[PDB]
Write a protein that binds this ligand. Structure first.
Ligand SMILES: COC1=C(OC)C(=O)C(C/C=C(\C)CC/C=C(\C)CC/C=C(\C)CC/C=C(\C)CC/C=C(\C)CC/C=C(/C)CC/C=C(\C)CC/C=C(\C)CCC=C(C)C)=C(C)C1=O
Ligand SMILES: CCCCCCCCCCCCCCCCCC(=O)OC[C@H](COP(=O)([O-])OCC[N+](C)(C)C)OC(=O)CCCCCCCCCCCCCCCCC
Ligand SMILES: CCCCCCCCCCCCCCCCCC(=O)OC[C@H](COP(=O)(O)OCCN)OC(=O)CCCCCCCCCCCCCCCCC
Ligand SMILES: CCCCCCCCCCCCCCCCCC(=O)OC[C@H](COP(=O)(O)OCCN)OC(=O)CCCCCCCCCCCCCCCCC
Ligand SMILES: CCCCCCCCCCCCCCCCCC(=O)OC[C@H](COP(=O)(O)OCCN)OC(=O)CCCCCCCCCCCCCCCCC
Ligand SMILES: CCCCCCCCCCCCCCCCCC(=O)OC[C@H](COP(=O)(O)OCCN)OC(=O)CCCCCCCCCCCCCCCCC
Ligand code: SF4
Ligand code: SF4
Lengths: 161, 186, 173, 315, 117, 66, 67, 97, 73
């Protein structure tokens, strides 16, 4: 069903159109992620978190990166913090567009999906321009981000904003 | 303006806090829109306005991109300007590959140089993470610019060394240009 | 001429209608016949105004009973009756044969169509339905219409009281 | 002479039939281009030359694709419902006014009311015949639509009828010679479009299809042949109902060229709205028809009963 | 009429030919036990569609039958306005529409127009 | 008050009833005006109406200009 | 209001309506640009900053390919 | 509304100048037909036991009417001696076949 | 770039206008008269019978030339 996002299986108990009981059968996308991680080095496990919450890409890395840092008991440089925080917000702006964009389609409105996914396309150029991938950047890492921003990116980040 | 039902502290913004006025000046204003489709009117002006904009579509394949030099795509084994393959079968790429998509078997070459007799990438298992090109100490393996290599058979997506080497020659000019413009960051 | 063929079809559809069991089979039979009767009535009248009204009225009743059929008699069965198909098809062609070899000046109904009226009839040159529907809204017969109004409104009070909406939906428990 | 007359009537219907059937093909393209431009997209542009032959390029596919024989469906009903859906869509065009006579149709306004109501059974039977949960919900979602718009539709037609004096559509031309009834009937024009959407089951009243609530509504179990006719029958309804708006509120100069410039524009409006509004909630429509529209429409019968009475005294 | 019936049949024949072309022009492949299974989002169905489907607008459903039969009595109005007595026509018509409104507002206020809850 | 509540809750029934009330008013003007002109006797008659000069109706022929 | 003057120009470099139509039929668009260069295989590369960023640089495939 | 009424009255006034003309024509042909039917009835039923022209076996179909009181017969009876084609040519002009 | 819509609207506008502009053409070519008689009112139908009887073609007009010019008196 299109609104189910291809994963959910609501076994509804319909008394006409009104729902009396809803059973969200989950697990159609269980890929034993947490068991594979037990077999992979910490660095090899970083990409797994891009996949979890796949619309908030760089936000999941940050959670993983912060966790490892607390155990490693290290601190990140001042510049890397701002790059992280900047890209946490860009990810947040991306994600809410998907939520607003997707939610509108479920209701039925179409144009907000396209008017916003045009901006979403511009935003994922910044992911592509720093990490090399439009999605699943694998950019945030426990020691801080993996590369400096390209020269002249920040001008284009301003231009979008 | 109407008042707020709940007083707001500092550093917080409310979305539905303002109450509804009950003055005839305002009720009629709400009534007029509710009665002549006033709210929907401006909604129709906006959508019509978008008719008069250049659409943002790109005429692919004649026009395409844009990308950046850091783009991760199809793989390729480079070689030195002499022609000798760069890869020395160090196997760092195999050990770091999150997907275990790389298989390497190495043997003492006839001339006695450490080299691979086997180098296979299972493109249906790779995730294009790019850890292989970061770990290679001699830049032997790179993710080339190509992203247009869809096939019609599963078997054709399993690259062996000869296929990888061919890409490293077809794409040599562009890879050498990306590395030069990007190595300092890396 | 088609009047006789309309006679045959209305007869044919009525024979099968006696033999329907499935409620929707009844409904389809009834819907088809409501078309013919509506068509036939306008042949013997100065206008088809009433066929339009009758057709519109019954279609309202057609939908509603499907809604209840689909809630009460949803799970039922059809059975093609080779006896029925042959019998109707047998008589149908038989009846159609007669209508070709019938003295169909004799079979035509004596009721005066609009054209059947004389040329001198001055009252036949007005709007198609002016006079006929006229005294529905003139003294004294207008009060009958008024009487319906209460009757219809009073009916509208009867259904809600019989129905007792608040005590739940309807299911075929 | 008379023998010849009815020959011409056949030609007109066939000519009107093929022309309407062709237009609904090109309307579907227009829907995709316009809806592709309200959205900042480009729309179909590659196939053939500049996308114009796109709808024909789709009519090939929907007919070279196999019929579906559902396991649990009453096949004969499932197989016939597309026919009557398309037939009723084309048949209602014979009442469209022509000054070059096609059909007299005194009481033409009623003939509209009868035909449009019939369009619900085809959806209704198709959904129930398919014998799928979604299809049945689509069918019963369509029937509930009729319970809402049907009554208010007649009353609003009656208001327009009071202005002209008869149910013959031709008289709309004479009374709209100096001006357009849009001015006198602005809220009804706005209301009438709203009900017109329900007739054709379009966003914001798209419940029979019910896309993204039901997977595809009552069409969920149709395929190559049946689904195509269901589709064409859908867009024939839009085209006619758009025309019926042009004869009522926009002059009704059927022999003038501009009337057809107007006709396409109202067709654009129907696409325009689909790209603006979200779908209503299944109950909010039925409440809307009975709580607001029905009360609204009755209020102006008094306004037009008084106005006609007042005008009758002067004239 | 008789003209319309003929074209009504002629159209029905034409539309009928369309699928009769589609049924032959359609690609033909062996039907599978799963190809003809119903569509219910890819998981087998628990419940036949022919179970009793509960109803909540039943009350409105009945009121719909009524309100139409008063549409049979308003429609003739126009046709007989030039020909009728104006007092009788005026009075009766008004007390026709007031009766309808009063009936509607009465039920609306009683909450019958709301669905079963 | 009452006026405010409805005007805030169901403004259409107020505006609609406002024009409905207009109908009754200007229906009461037109109907009274109709018998203020003796409009039962209409100068143009449907059909071919011919009276004898001595018939009572022949006196009541409405005499107009055009 | 004055795009026709551009439109006529596109025809002239195209080589008349006959070659203009084949261009439209092939590339699905008519655009003005300066020939940046020609590759070994005949593809001609154009550029015009007038258009927006994505459509700024485009390529004409070799004639012999044709679809 | 004035202009529509203006035009309508003009159309109706044209009828009242043509309507008397047709009535004159119809009467002079309606009567002529009646003689033929009264003559066709005589020839058709020479040998019937007790048939009298214009009555059901001698029973007048109107007892109260004054003498020589002409009564327009039924449409069907007017066409009692005619093919179906002529009948349908007038009764179905509205429907057009 | 809003031009690309117009090719869609031109076709629909033309196709829908073919019928009325075709019958106006066919009737002239095949009746001799642009419009066909309107059987909307009894009087129209009545006279239509009259024309169909006299000329044996309702759309062929009988001008004054049908009148017997002279009477010998
Ligand atoms: C990703 O997010 C999104 C979604 O979420 C899933 C959406 O749902 C959506 C949903 C989008 C929509 C609902 C758009 C509206 C589209 C649809 C509902 C259906 C898609 C189909 C179309 C648009 C095509 C329109 C046309 C049809 C379906 C077929 C209609 C029938 C047609 C055209 C035939 C007309 C008949 C004719 C006689 C015309 C003239 C002649 C022909 C066709 C004959 C053809 C050829 C021959 C006879 C061969 C002869 C050969 C020889 C003699 C040699 C969007 C946009 C989205 O972005
Ligand atoms: C009560 C109100 C009902 C209002 C709806 C009336 C129409 C519903 C008919 C549903 C189908 C009935 C049926 O199953 O008969 C199968 C019949 C055959 O009967 P059958 O008995 O042979 O079917 C069973 C077959 N076996 C034995 C193998 C299991 O097939 C038909 O021909 C039905 C054709 C229906 C055509 C579609 C109707 C649409 C009408 C649109 C409006 C009018 C234009
Ligand atoms: C009648 C025949 C009309 C088509 C003749 C085509 C002759 C031109 C040369 C061959 C050709 O190009 O045919 C395909 C044609 C254009 O090529 P196309 O596949 O659309 O690729 C995109 C182009 N921008 O695309 C077409 O226009 C072919 C369309 C033919 C089918 C149209 C559907 C109606 C049935 C017609 C029979
Ligand atoms: C096998 C049986 C074959 C017999 C034909 C059965 C199919 C009937 C299709 C014709 C229905 C239309 C019709 O006949 O209308 C007749 C009548 C017209 O009356 P009028 O206002 O004077 O207009 C005349 C204009 N020439 O207007 C009416 O009487 C009302 C007609 C309503 C039509 C609803 C549409 C039905 C579609 C067919 C369903 C099957
Ligand atoms: C000037 C007329 C003043 C009328 C005052 C009505 C004020 C509030 C109307 C309203 O809708 O409030 C809610 C009330 C509750 O009724 P309920 O049983 O919940 O049914 C659904 C109602 N929307 O709804 C109602 O009970 C009545 C709603 C219809 C009243 C229309 C009266 C119009 C009289 C002219
Ligand atoms: C450029 C081309 C643009 C084309 C635009 C076409 C738009 C087509 C689509 C329109 C449908 C939009 C969605 C819809 O259906 O809305 C209906 C409207 C919404 O209002 P509603 O939902 O009832 O409000 C909340 C109720 N709880 O429902 C309504 O409430 C509308 C009710 C209308 C009532 C109008 C009353 C008018 C009264 C006139 C007189 C007023 C002046 C003061 C009184 C005078 C007295 C003398
Ligand atoms: S890109 Fe990542 S997953 Fe793919 S081969 Fe290289 S290291 Fe392995
Ligand atoms: S890391 Fe580089 S040198 Fe080492 S085995 Fe891999 S490709 Fe060869």
């Amino acid at each position: 069903h299109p609104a189910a996002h291809g994963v959910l299986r609501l076994v509804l108990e319909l008394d006409g159109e009104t729902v009396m009981r809803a059973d969200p059968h989950i697990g159609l996308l269980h890929r034993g992620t947490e068991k594979l991680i037990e077999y992979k080095t910490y660095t090899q496990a970083l990409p797994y978190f891009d996949r979890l919450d796949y619309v908030s890409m760089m936000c999941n890395e940050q959670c993983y990166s912060l966790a490892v840092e607390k155990l490693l008991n290290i601190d990140v440089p001042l510049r890397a913090k701002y790059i992280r925080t900047l890209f946490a917000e860009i990810t947040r702006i991306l994600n809410h567009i998907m939520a607003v964009g997707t939610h509108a389609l479920d209701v039925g409105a179409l144009t907000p999906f396209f008017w916003l996914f045009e901006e979403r396309e511009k935003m994922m150029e910044f992911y592509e321009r720093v990490s090399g991938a439009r999605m699943h950047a694998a950019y945030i890492r426990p020691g801080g981000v993996s590369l400096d921003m390209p020269l002249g990116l920040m001008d284009d980040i301003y231009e979008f904003a | 303006e109407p008042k707020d039902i709940v007083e707001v502290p500092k550093g917080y913004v409310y979305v539905n806090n303002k109450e509804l006025s009950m003055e005839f000046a305002d009720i009629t204003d709400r009534a007029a829109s509710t009665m002549f489709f006033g709210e929907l009117l401006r909604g129709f002006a906006v959508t019509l306005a978008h008719i008069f904009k250049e659409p943002a579509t790109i005429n692919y394949p004649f026009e395409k991109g844009p990308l950046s030099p850091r783009f991760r795509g199809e793989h390729a084994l480079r070689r030195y300007p002499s022609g000798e393959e760069r890869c020395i079968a160090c196997k760092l790429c195999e050990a770091i590959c999150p997907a275990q998509a790389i298989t390497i078997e190495a043997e003492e070459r006839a001339d006695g140089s450490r080299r691979t007799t086997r180098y296979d990438i299972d493109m249906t298992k790779c995730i294009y993470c790019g850890f292989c090109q970061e770990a290679c100490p001699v830049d032997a393996i790179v993710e080339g610019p190509n992203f247009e290599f869809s096939t019609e058979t599963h078997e054709e997506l399993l690259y062996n060394k000869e296929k990888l080497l061919c890409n490293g020659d077809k794409w040599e000019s562009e890879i050498a240009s990306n590395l030069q413009a990007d190595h300092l960051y890396r | 001429m088609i009047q006789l063929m309309l006679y045959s079809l209305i007869i044919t559809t009525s024979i099968i209608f006696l033999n329907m069991i499935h409620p929707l089979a009844l409904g389809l039979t009834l819907l088809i016949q409501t078309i013919f009767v509506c068509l036939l009535t306008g042949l013997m009248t100065k206008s088809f105004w009433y066929s339009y009204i009758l057709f519109l009225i019954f279609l309202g009743g057609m939908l509603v009973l499907f809604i209840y059929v689909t809630s009460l008699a949803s799970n039922e069965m059809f059975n093609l009756s080779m006896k029925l198909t042959l019998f109707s098809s047998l008589i149908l062609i038989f009846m159609l044969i007669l209508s070709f070899i019938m003295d169909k000046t004799s079979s035509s109904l004596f009721l005066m169509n609009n054209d059947m009226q004389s040329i001198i009839n001055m009252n036949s040159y007005f709007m198609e339905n002016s006079l006929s529907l006229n005294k529905l809204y003139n003294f004294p017969t207008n009060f009958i219409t008024i009487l319906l109004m209460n009757y219809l409104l009073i009916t509208l009070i009867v259904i809600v009281k019989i129905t007792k909406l608040f005590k739940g939906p309807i299911r075929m428990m | 002479m008379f023998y010849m007359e009815f020959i011409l009537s056949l030609i007109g219907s066939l000519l009107l039939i093929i022309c309407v059937l062709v237009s609904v093909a090109f309307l579907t393209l227009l829907e995709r281009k316009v809806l592709g431009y309200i959205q900042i997209r480009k729309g179909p542009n590659k196939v053939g030359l500049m996308g114009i032959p796109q709808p024909f390029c789709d009519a090939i596919k929907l007919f070279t694709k196999e019929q579906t024989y559902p396991l649990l469906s009453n096949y004969l009903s499932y197989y016939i419902s597309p026919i009557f859906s398309l037939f009723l869509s084309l048949f209602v065009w014979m009442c469209m006014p022509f000054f070059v006579k096609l059909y007299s149709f005194n009481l033409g306004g009623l003939f509209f009311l009868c035909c449009t109501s019939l369009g619900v059974y085809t959806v209704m039977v198709a959904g129930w015949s398919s014998n799928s949960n979604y299809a049945l919900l689509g069918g019963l979602r369509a029937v509930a639509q009729t319970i809402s718009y049907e009554v208010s539709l007649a009353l609003i037609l009656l208001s327009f009828i009071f202005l002209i004096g008869s149910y013959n559509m031709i008289y709309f031309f004479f009374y709209q010679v100096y001006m357009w009834f849009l001015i006198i009937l602005f809220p009804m024009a706005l209301v009438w479009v709203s009900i017109s959407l329900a007739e054709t089951n379009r966003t914001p009243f798209d419940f029979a299809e019910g896309e993204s609530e039901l997977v595809s509504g009552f069409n969920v179990e149709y395929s190559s042949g049946g689904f195509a006719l269901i589709f064409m029958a859908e867009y024939a309804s839009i085209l006619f109902m758009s025309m019926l708006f042009c004869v009522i509120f926009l002059g009704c100069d059927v022999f003038n060229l501009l009337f057809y410039m107007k006709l396409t524009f109202i067709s654009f409006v129907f696409i325009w709205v689909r790209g603006t509004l979200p779908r209503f909630r299944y109950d909010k429509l039925m409440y809307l028809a009975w709580k607001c529209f029905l009360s609204f429409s009755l209020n102006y019968l008094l306004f037009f009963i008084g106005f006609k009475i007042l005008l009758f005294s002067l004239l | 009429m008789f003209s319309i019936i003929f074209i009504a049949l002629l159209i029905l024949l034409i539309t009928t030919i369309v699928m009769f072309l589609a049924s032959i022009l359609s690609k033909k492949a062996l039907i599978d036990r799963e190809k003809s299974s119903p569509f219910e989002c890819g998981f087998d169905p628990k419940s036949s569609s022919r179970l009793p489907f509960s109803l909540r607008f039943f009350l409105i459903t009945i009121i719909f039958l009524i309100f139409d039969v008063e549409i049979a009595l308003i429609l003739p109005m126009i046709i007989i306005m030039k020909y009728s007595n104006i007092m009788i026509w005026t009075i009766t018509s008004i007390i026709f529409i007031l009766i309808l409104l009063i009936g509607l507002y009465h039920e609306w206020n009683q909450g019958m127009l709301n669905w079963s809850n | 008050s009452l006026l405010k509540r409805a005007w805030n809750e169901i403004p259409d029934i107020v505006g609609g009833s406002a024009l409905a009330l207009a109908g009754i008013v200007m229906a009461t003007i037109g109907v009274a005006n109709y018998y203020a002109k003796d409009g039962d006797n209409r100068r143009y008659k449907l059909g071919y109406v011919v009276y004898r000069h001595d018939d009572p109706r022949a006196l009541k022929v409405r005499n107009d200009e055009d | 209001i004055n795009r026709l003057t551009k439109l006529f120009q596109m025809v002239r470099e195209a080589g008349g309506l006959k070659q203009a139509y084949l261009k439209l039929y092939r590339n699905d668009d008519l655009k003005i640009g300066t020939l940046v260069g020609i590759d070994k295989y005949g593809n001609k590369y154009f550029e015009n900053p007038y258009y927006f960023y994505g459509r700024n640089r485009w390529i004409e495939f070799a004639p012999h390919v044709n679809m | 509304a004035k202009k529509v009424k203006r035009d309508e009255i003009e159309m109706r006034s044209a009828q009242n100048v043509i309507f008397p003309i047709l009535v004159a024509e119809r009467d002079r042909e309606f009567l002529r037909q009646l003689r033929r039917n009264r003559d066709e009835e005589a020839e058709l039923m020479k040998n019937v036991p007790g048939w009298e022209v214009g009555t059901w076996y001698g029973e007048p179909v109107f007892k109260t009417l004054p003498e020589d009181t002409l009564v327009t017969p039924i449409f069907k009876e007017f066409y009692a001696h005619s093919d179906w084609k002529s009948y349908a040519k007038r009764a179905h002009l509205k429907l057009w076949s | 770039m809003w031009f690309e819509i117009l090719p869609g609207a031109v076709i629909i506008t033309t196709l829908l206008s073919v019928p009325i502009y075709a019958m106006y053409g066919l009737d002239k070519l095949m009746i001799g008269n642009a419009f066909r008689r309107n059987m909307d009112e009894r009087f129209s139908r009545v006279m239509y019978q009259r024309d169909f009887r006299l000329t044996d073609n309702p759309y062929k007009m009988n001008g004054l030339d049908a009148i017997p010019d002279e009477k010998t008196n």
